[PDB]
C-alpha cells in the first residue's frame, strides 16, 4: 500500500564480557548480564543492605559472596 513508481556492539560485549547470563543468589536471586557488573555488585547499596540487615557486616571480607548460606558461617568465623 503506497509503493508507487513514477512515470549492536556484538563482538564488543562478548569481548568486554557483558550480556552473559549470570545470577547473584543473595540479591533476590537476581540476574546479571556481565561479570564486570556483578563484580561491581560487591560494592552497592542494596547488596550491603542485604548483608548488613542479614547480620553479615559490610565491606571487603565478604566480597566474593554468592549464596546467603556460606557467608553466615564465614560471619560466625568473624
Amino acid at each position: 500500500e503506497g509503493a508507487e513508481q513514477v512515470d549492536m556492539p556484538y563482538w564488543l560485549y562478548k569481548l568486554h564480557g557483558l550480556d552473559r547470563e549470570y545470577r547473584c543468589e543473595i540479591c533476590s536471586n537476581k540476574v546479571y548480564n556481565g561479570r564486570r557488573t556483578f563484580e561491581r555488585h560487591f560494592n552497592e547499596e542494596r547488596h550491603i543492605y542485604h548483608l548488613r540487615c542479614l547480620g553479615i557486616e559490610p565491606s571487603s571480607v565478604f566480597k566474593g559472596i554468592t549464596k546467603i548460606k556460606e557467608a553466615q558461617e564465614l560471619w560466625k568465623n568473624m
Binding site: V61, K63, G64, T66, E70, A71, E73, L74, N77
Partner: peptide, 21 residues
C-alpha cells in the same frame, strides 16, 4: 570435566584462610 566440577566454593576456601579478603 569432573575435576573442573570438583572445585570447592571460594567461601569454603575462605575459612582455611587467616586473611580471607
Amino acid at each position: 570435566k569432573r575435576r573442573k566440577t570438583e572445585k570447592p566454593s571460594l567461601s569454603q576456601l575462605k575459612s582455611q584462610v587467616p586473611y580471607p579478603q
